[model samples]
Target: GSSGSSGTEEIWVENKTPDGKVYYYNARTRESAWTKPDGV
Candidate 1:
C-alpha cells in the first residue's frame, strides 16, 4: 500500500514452481499471495 498507487490486479495465477523462474506479474489490487516474493 505504501507504493502510492491505485491497487493490484484480480487473478489467481497457478504457479507450478516456487523459486524456479521469477515471473514479474503486476497486480492492480495488490494482496498477499503464496506465489512469489513480497511485492511480485
Candidate 2:
C-alpha cells in the first residue's frame, strides 16, 4: 500500500496480473482499477 503526495487518507496498493500488467487497488473501498487514481 502507498500514500500519495496529495495527502489523502486512502491507501493505494499496486497489484500485478499474470501477464505482468499493473493495477491500483483502493484499500478502504476494496476496489480495483487499471488506471491510477487521482491522488495516487
Candidate 3:
C-alpha cells in the first residue's frame, strides 16, 4: 500500500555520527533522515 514502509514495526534502525548527529527511521512519518539532514 505504501512505498516507504517495509514491515509492521517500522524500520527500527538508528545511527549517529561521532559528532552527535543522530539518524532515525520514523514509522509514523514513514521516512528516514539524519540529524538536520533535511534542508533545501
Q: Each model's RMSD to truth, in Å?
A: 10.4, 6.2, 11.2
Q: What TM-score goes with each of the models?
A: 0.21, 0.53, 0.30
lDDT tens digits by residue: candidate 3, 1-40: 5576635433445777577878766665657576324331
Leading candidate by TM-score: 2
The 10 consecutive residues of candidate 1 with the worst lDDT sum are 22-31
The digit string of per-residue lDDT tens for model 2 on 1-40 reads 5765655434777789788899888887898887756744
lDDT of each: 0.49, 0.74, 0.57
Each candidate's clash count: 9, 0, 0
lDDT of 1 by residue, 1-40 (tens): 6678846643544343476753434365554345545543
| Index of the highest-lDDT prediction | 2
User: Which portions of model 3 show Cα errors greater than 4 Å?
Assistant: 1-22, 36-40
lDDT of 1: 0.49
**Candidate 1 ranges with C-alpha deviation above 4 Å:** 1-19, 29-40
- Candidate 2 C-alpha error for residue 29, in Å: 0.8
